[PDB]
């Protein structure tokens, strides 16, 4: 790997610089290098990893959606034939997106998840696994679409099971996991009722535990609670 010659600490330093510069591809490459050193990641370092790849794949997903919409419109009655270019370019973006997802999944499988024993780390990585399978599912249309969806579900479910046993209902990782799994149900699994039930139960159980929190923990938890409420408002 191109980062093999750089010190772990220097990769982490540079990932932080890249974030400040809004250079998210660089940020992700630095963090991939850091993971490949083989040591476990701290909380802060896990956050750097997630932010980097979230921003890279988020841009790819937005571009894919633009291109997919143009492609769909081209396939409507009365649309003039414009050749293979729209499909080709959507495919190009799609392949690059899949590549990023496969990279992240690969880091999780080799060997972040297996080394993660604390609930906070293990849930964080399993949530990521669910998220990147969900991104693969968004673009999947073939023989494997069901298996990709099931991979996302399985990762999310393991993360939910651990989170419910090991973390308080206000824990931001638990909350963010539930938020995203709820979106999986609504957008990927064709299960809007499950999505709504999860979001509501998660919100309500968090509400009941806010009294235990410091001001700073309260801020963190309530931020994600508001995202749950925002989705519920969208869906009801």
């Amino acid at each position: 790997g191109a980062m093999g010659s750089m010190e772990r600490a220097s990769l982490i330093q540079k990932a932080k610089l890249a974030e400040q510069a809004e250079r998210y591809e660089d940020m992700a490459a630095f963090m991939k290098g850091a993971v490949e050193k083989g040591e476990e990641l701290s909380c802060e370092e896990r956050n750097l990893l997630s932010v980097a790849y979230k921003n890279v794949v988020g841009g790819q997903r937005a571009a894919w959606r633009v291109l997919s919409s143009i492609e769909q419109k081209s396939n409507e009655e009365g649309s003039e034939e414009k050749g293979p270019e729209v499909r080709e370019y959507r495919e190009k973006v799609e392949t690059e997106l899949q590549g990023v997802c496969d990279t992240v999944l690969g880091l999780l499988d080799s060997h972040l998840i297996k080394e993660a024993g604390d609930a906070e780390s293990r849930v964080f990585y399993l949530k990521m696994k669910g998220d990147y399978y969900r991104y693969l599912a968004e673009v999947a249309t073939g023989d494997d679409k069901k298996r990709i969806i099931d991979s996302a579900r399985s990762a999310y479910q393991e993360a939910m099971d651990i989170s419910k046993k090991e973390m308080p209902p206000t824990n931001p990782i638990r909350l963010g996991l539930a938020l995203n799994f709820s979106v999986f149900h609504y957008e990927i699994a064709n299960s809007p009722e499950e999505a709504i039930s999860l979001a509501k139960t998660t919100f309500d159980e968090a509400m009941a535990d806010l009294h235990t929190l410091s001001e700073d923990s309260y801020k963190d938890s309530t931020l994600i609670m508001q995202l749950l409420r925002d989705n519920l408002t969208l869906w009801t």
């Binding site: 938020l179 609504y186 989705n231």
Partner: peptide
């Protein structure tokens, strides 16, 4: 699109 984190 719905919110995720």
């Amino acid at each position: 699109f719905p919110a995720t984190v």
